[PDB]
Design a protein around this nucleic acid. Structure first.
Lengths: 422, 17
RNA sequence: AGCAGAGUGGCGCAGCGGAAGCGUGCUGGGCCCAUAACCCAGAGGUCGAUGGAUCGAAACCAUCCUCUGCUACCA
């Protein structure tokens, strides 16, 4: 299954497929083929098995040696050991977030259900690069600090440039946790020092305490239909949710409720929403059958919902509770909030436009990323430490946790501040 | 912090031309 | 992946059991002192593939082949 969710976030032009296939062995993929124009801009999924020969390096199935195929310029070979079967240490899960700035709201959502991260830095561009800081800050807000910085694209980048970049990032982030996070330079054109990464992810990132006894909550981020185009009438199936569970052991045959709900017909107001109920058909993770779905892992829960809800990606950031979950489904919400004194996620060589942003004005639409949900809503009352927001589609608030608040600076939204629900 | 980096830098960059 | 379209001369592209068409270039010659437009002949044919029912498949039938498109992505 899975034990931890390590995320693979990283700004434009570092190469995703080479690094993702080295760590998991499962390709990051989704629509267009044209696998991506540059680096993956979709929310990729992948799981993997991490075993040892009693060595800090992680074998392949063929554990005698491993000859890469990253480049035919030279032969990159590494040796994990010699063969006689290897001991399974754990089953790991990844969360490949978008690597592009416009997709920030999606990157936030996907990130918010991980248990650790890997900041994929690229040495090609600017030294205190916008997105590195954006990522790091969001991570410390959500409730994580289990980060391993990875210098992913320094294959042709000289050692002065690459040294200056790690220095400037680590010096800018002087108020964000990063001093207890290692910085592992690797090759992505010769897959070198990959074996030492395997030692790091088992060290810096154990399994955090998971609450089995507590009531099941599944947060769905990806939508999958298994009926698909060309289905037969008596080959009928349910609709499958790619979600991570962050609380409770969800068992097979259990009934689960999707709690933001669907709005009642001919509503004259903003209420009323009614949750949808679906019975769990199957609990699939990796490529191995399971009867349980332990928390701390990203699992494909097939449920008895019908094709229309899974025919496109429409279940992004929905909260699912088993069953008749107590969590309130607000339509208008009381945010406590604070703002950054800089504009996060933007800053170029001329140092534009990380200038301090003006105060929020009422009746402006802002993206409130609450939980893994992403709703848009307008601010109806605006006091400094008390704003009232009215949301277009209702938000199930599992706990008052955190929020991330963004404002439409130009073409798309950009992160301005965070806070906590009251 | 930077020990992790420099150890692996002298591992990596010795194998470059 | 399933799905709407296509399979013809270089290109455009008629056509359907008793027929490889026509448009455009192609090349020669004529008219005229000569070219041009024009006219004539010349030149360009696995009609995807694999067969079957058949007195005969360019035509029926089934499959395979391809690009053109769809819910937009299918653990």
């Amino acid at each position: 299954q899975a034990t931890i969710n390590i995320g693979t976030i990283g700004h434009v032009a570092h190469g995703k497929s080479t690094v993702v296939k080295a760590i998991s062995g499962v390709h990051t993929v989704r629509f267009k083929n044209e696998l991506e124009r540059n680096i993956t801009i979709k929310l990729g999924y992948a799981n993997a098995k991490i075993y040892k020969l009693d060595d800090p390096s992680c074998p392949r199935p063929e554990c005698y040696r491993s000859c890469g195929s990253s480049t035919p310029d030279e032969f990159p070979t590494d040796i994990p050991g010699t063969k006689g079967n290897f001991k399974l240490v754990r089953h790991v899960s990844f969360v490949d977030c978008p690597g592009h700035d416009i997709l920030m709201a999606t990157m936030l959502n996907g990130a918010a259900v991980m248990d650790a991260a890997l900041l994929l830095i690229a040495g090609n561009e600017s030294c205190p690069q916008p997105q590195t800081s954006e990522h790091l800050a969001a991570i410390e807000i959500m409730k994580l600090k289990h980060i391993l910085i990875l210098q992913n694209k320094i294959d042709l980048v000289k050692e002065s440039q690459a040294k200056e970049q790690y220095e400037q990032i680590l010096a800018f982030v002087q108020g964000t946790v990063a001093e207890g996070a290692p910085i592992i330079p690797i090759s992505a054109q010769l897959k070198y020092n990959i074996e030492v990464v395997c030692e790091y992810i088992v060290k810096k990132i154990p399994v955090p305490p998971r609450d089995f006894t507590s009531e099941p909550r599944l947060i769905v981020i990806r939508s999958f239909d298994v009926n698909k185009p060309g289905c037969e009438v008596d080959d009928l199936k349910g609709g499958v949710a790619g979600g991570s569970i962050l609380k409770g052991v969800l068992k097979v045959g259990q009934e689960i409720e999707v709690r933001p709900g669907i709005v009642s017909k001919d509503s004259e107001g903003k209420l009323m929403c009614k949750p949808i109920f679906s019975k769990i058909v199957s609990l699939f993770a990796e490529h191995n059958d399971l009867q349980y779905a332990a928390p701390g892992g990203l699992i494909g829960v097939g449920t008895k919902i019908d094709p229309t809800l899974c025919r496109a990606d429409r279940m992004v950031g929905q909260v699912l509770g088993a069953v008749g979950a107590l969590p309130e489904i607000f339509t208008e919400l009381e945010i406590s909030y604070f703002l950054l004194r800089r504009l996060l996620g933007v800053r170029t060589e001329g140092d534009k436009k990380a200038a301090k942003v003006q105060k929020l004005s009422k009746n402006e639409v802002l993206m409130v990323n609450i939980g893994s949900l992403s709703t848009g809503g307008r601010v109806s009352a605006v006091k400094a430490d008390l704003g009232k927001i009215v949301l277009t589609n209702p938000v199930c608030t599992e706990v008052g946790e955190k929020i991330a608040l963004s404002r439409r600076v130009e073409k798309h939204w950009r992160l301005i501040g965070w806070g906590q629900i009251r | 912090s930077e020990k992790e980096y420099v150890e692996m830098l002298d591992r990596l960059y010795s194998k470059l031309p």
